[PDB]
Design a binder for this molecule. Structure first.
Ligand SMILES: O=c1ccn([C@@H]2O[C@@H](CN3CCCCC3)[C@H](O)[C@H]2O)c(=O)[nH]1
Length: 124
């Protein structure tokens, strides 16, 4: 069974590309990472940094999570990310997304032993 840490990697990690991300990127990635099976997942971010660098965020700036929990961490440096947002005309099963590349500080929730990212909270 898929661990929370593994689910985070599936939903949020894409170390393979530096940034770029073609206009097609989100359409392809949301589908291939299995985020379009149950529904069109409305909002999802992929991080283009090493797994070690993203895992390292769990020891960085402690900040409040959007849900009020205390286990979120903001990266000290900006990271290459791609936001995927479902378009207004997108209709399941044909999920359609706008692809937006940015360099921003990520905020992730961390849990477990080892203490690793399990949720992508925000970018700032
Ligand atoms: O900048 C982001 C922000 C959110 N997410 C996604 O949406 C988050 C939570 N969700 C958002 C609104 C509906 C109920 C709660 C998920 O934890 C995360 O997968 C991003 O991926 N990148």
């Amino acid at each position: 069974k898929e661990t929370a840490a593994a689910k985070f990697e599936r939903q949020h990690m894409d170390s393979s590309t530096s940034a770029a991300s073609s206009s097609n990127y989100c359409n392809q990635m949301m589908k291939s990472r299995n985020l379009t099976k149950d529904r069109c997942k409305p909002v999802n971010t992929f991080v283009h940094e090493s797994l070690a660098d993203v895992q390292a965020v769990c020891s960085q700036k402690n900040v409040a999570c959007k849900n009020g929990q205390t286990n979120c961490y903001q990266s000290y440096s900006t990271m290459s990310i791609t936001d995927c947002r479902e378009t207004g005309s997108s209709k399941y099963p044909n999920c359609a997304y706008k692809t937006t590349q940015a360099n921003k500080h990520i905020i992730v929730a961390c849990e477990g032993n080892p203490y690793v990212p399990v949720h992508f909270d925000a970018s700032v």
